[PDB]
Every structure is written in C-alpha cells, then in structure tokens.
C-alpha cells in the first residue's frame, strides 16, 4: 500500500466568539414549564470554557463523548435552561418517564446532546421561601418532546366538569416550587442548561477551535 | 470597576429627616439586588435594609423596623434611602453595597461595594 | 439567633509569613459564610464567597476554608497592603446579614 505522509484539515472562516456566557453566567433561569430557548449560529464555539469548572458537576452527554466537543463542527446548537429540583435531575434523560418528563420538559427517543446542572442554593434560596419558579403539575397526557406547554387552563379530569371555575372538582395545574436553604440536597434547587446539536450534513455555522493549514492538491 | 457614588450626608438635629441616594454606572442595574449597608465608628458592619432586582420582595433591619424606607428606581438606574425618626444612635457610615443575586434574603452575599457617606445626627454648628 | 465570635482581635506578623483568623458560629450555618476584607482607606470589598470559593479578581493567596460551625480565612505570602480588617457574615438563618467582630491584622 501507500501511506500518506501529509494531512490537511480546512475549517470556516469565522473566527469570533459566540456567547455561551450570557447563558450559563444569567442571573436568573424562566420558569420549567416555560423553558427558555436560546440558538447559536455563526461562531467558533470554546468549550474549555465549561469544562474546567469545579461546580458545573452534572455533565453527562447522550451521543457524543464530552471530552471531543473541542473539535467537532455543528450546523446548530440550541440552549434550553431551566430551574428543577435537586431529585428531579435525573428526570432529565430520553425515554424515561417522571413528572417534568411528561408535562414540562421531554427529551426524543433520538436525541443528540449533552445536558449539564450544578448546584444553584446560592442565588434560588430565600429563608422565607422562593415562588418565582412554577411547575405544571396537570395535564391529559405526556407532552411531547421539545414542546412548551403554558396553557393555564383549570384542570378538570373527572366526570363532573366545573366549566372552567376553580370550584368543587377543579384545580390550577400550576404549582410553585418552594426553595429554602434549610432543605436538603433532595429538593435543593438545581439550575439546568440542556445543548441539542443538529448534527447533519448541511453548510455548519457553528466548529470547534482549530486551525487550518494549506490545502494540499495531490 | 464599577461605579457607585453616594450623597445627601450631612448633620441633621434629632427627629429630622435626611435623603441618601446612589447611583450606579459599572454594571446591569435593572436586574440586581441591593442593600445598605451600616459602618459604626468604633463597631463593625451591620446590615439595615434591602430591595430585590424589582420592587416586590423588601426587608428592613431589626433595630429600625417601622423607620426607614428604601426605594428603587430602574430608570435612572439608582435607588434612594430616605431617613425618618432619627435618634442619637444613627451616626455611623452608611455604605451602598451591591448584592450578585436578584432575591432579597439569599446565601449569596454583596458582591460590590462603594465609597460610604458620613451622617452625624447630634445638635452643633 | 446566630452569634459569631473571633478569637483572635490583634494579629502581628512580618511581611513574609503566614496569619490564620477563624470565624466561629453560635449555631450551624450549612457553610453559608463569607469573608470580607476592608480598608480603613477605601470601600471595603469580599474576598471570599461561599465556603471555600474565591471572588475572581482578587489574588488567589487568600483561600476559604471550613464548614458548618467553624470557618477560616488564611493567607500565605503577606504583601505590604494586608494591613486591614477582616470582617466574617452569614447569610443562611432568620436574623439576616448580620456580621463578626473585626479582625485586626498588623505587621510587625
């Protein structure tokens, strides 16, 4: 055979640095149900960045190894954050089933990402008590994935309905979180940023940091 | 790097009301907490009251319960301290501290500082 | 109610040694406490939030430590500029905010 003795690589000309930060470093994450979206395009995307820091604990990626995020090129990446409870983690994974799973937050069967949560006591905890965060608590059915669902309709599930008053057999399907520093780990508020890459075979917009070389002909 | 400045301070007699304002200019305002901040002049730093990123969540110190009001406006990105009922106790420095989280009683403490303004509440020239 | 005591109130030292201050609390306070330096000449500023994490920007030769019930700032390398007082808060029961005794730190 014949080996080859020369290798090139040829990478977009884009060179400026798109904002992870002012998603991680936001001072305050929407509601669960609500969950904000926010999409990368156009950049070199570093992410060094993330992985050196001590408290981002909770790094675990569906498809694609963490380690190689470095290199690899991406059409489109979207970054979805949210504030859930330290036990309702791990409700976070495609194909499995739990509350915010199936009315708030559901990740496809085919899902391509990686999700991240660390510990947020240090800016979600009030002594007398957090509600700025909801929760659906209600609805028909499992909600499907990538979906969000703020309907604010009183729920009525039995056979007598209400019409749609909170009366006798009616409840608001929203329900706040109460976070406190004195609980525990358990139900201790974890802030959440979930990163969907829309791997494909389309002109990509968003790489790695890597450096071209000559483009080498025969 | 941020800015923070401070005024009103002054000499006023027992039981008259005085004015404290700061304003900030090195940071985002419309989404931060802030407090003020007390400074005796032989004692240590002791906490007097607070105002959350917007106007909804405000707590006040113990010992001036029912005495001082806080108030906060984004638009002008500074928030004002008015001063009622003084007695001969309240001649300390008084320091505009700026806290990282938006909530108002958090573990997360004040992140950024500025220049204290004096207040002597006594009867002189 | 929390009460926070500091067994050390005069400190002396050379420029090139080492000072330790702890910070002890009344009762537990979940390692919600923070450490904040202050000038006598200019607007006191936090060193270290949390119990053991570093405020960007400052130098890394001061470092938190301590968990719960007993807390500690050190220092290593003593420049010229430390003389200052040090001040410890907590901020995780119903009596909010409320800060140690001072801490004074002179170099012999």
């Excluded at chain 1, 609805?139 to 599930?157: C, G, H, M, V, W």
């Excluded at chain 2, 004692?43 to 906060?72: C, H, M, P, Q």
């Amino acid at each position: 055979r014949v080996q080859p003795t020369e290798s090139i690589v040829r990478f977009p000309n884009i060179t400026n640095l798109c904002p992870f930060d002012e998603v991680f470093n936001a001072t305050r994450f929407a509601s669960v149900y609500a969950w904000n979206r926010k999409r990368i395009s156009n950049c070199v995307a570093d992410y060094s960045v993330l992985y050196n820091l001590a408290p981002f604990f909770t790094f675990k990626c569906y498809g694609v190894s963490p380690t190689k995020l470095n290199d690899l090129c991406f059409t489109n990446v979207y970054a979805d954050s949210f504030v859930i409870r330290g036990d309702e983690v791990r409700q976070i994974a495609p194909g499995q089933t739990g509350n915010i799973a199936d009315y708030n937050y559901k990740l496809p069967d085919d899902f391509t990402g990686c999700v991240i949560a660390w510990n947020s006591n240090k800016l979600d905890s009030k002594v007398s008590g957090n509600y700025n965060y909801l929760y659906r608590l209600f609805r028909k059915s499992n909600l499907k994935p990538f979906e969000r669902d703020i309907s604010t309709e009183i729920y009525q599930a039995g056979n007598k309905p209400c019409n749609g008053v909170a009366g006798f057999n009616c409840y608001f399907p929203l329900r706040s979180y109460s976070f406190r520093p004195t609980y525990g780990v358990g139900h201790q508020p974890y802030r959440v940023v979930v990163l969907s890459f829309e791997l494909l075979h389309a002109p990509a917009t968003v790489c790695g940091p890597k450096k071209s070389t000559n483009l080498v002909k025969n | 790097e941020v800015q923070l400045v401070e005024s009103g301070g002054g000499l006023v007699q027992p039981g008259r009301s005085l004015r404290l304002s700061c304003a900030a200019s090195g940071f985002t305002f419309d989404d931060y907490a802030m407090h003020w901040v007390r400074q005796a002049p032989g004692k240590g730093l002791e906490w007097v009251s607070g105002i959350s990123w917007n106007s909804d969540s405000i707590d006040y110190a113990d010992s001036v319960k029912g005495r001082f009001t806080i108030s906060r406006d984004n638009a002008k990105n500074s928030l004002y301290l008015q001063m009622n009922s003084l007695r001969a106790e309240d001649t300390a420095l008084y320091y505009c501290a700026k806290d990282r989280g938006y909530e108002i009683l958090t573990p997360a403490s004040f992140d950024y500082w500025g220049q204290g303004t004096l207040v002597t509440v006594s009867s002189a020239s | 109610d929390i009460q926070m005591t500091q067994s050390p109130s005069s400190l002396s030292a050379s420029v090139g040694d080492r000072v330790t201050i702890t910070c002890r609390a009344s009762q537990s306070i979940s390692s919600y406490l923070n450490w904040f330096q202050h000038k006598p000449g200019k607007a006191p500023k936090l060193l270290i939030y949390g119990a053991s994490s570093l405020q960007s920007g400052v130098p890394s030769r001061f470092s938190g430590s301590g968990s719960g019930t007993d807390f500690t700032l050190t220092i290593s390398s003593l420049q010229p500029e430390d003389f200052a007082t040090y001040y410890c808060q907590q901020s995780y029961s119903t009596p909010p905010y409320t800060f140690g005794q001072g801490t004074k730190l002179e170099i012999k």
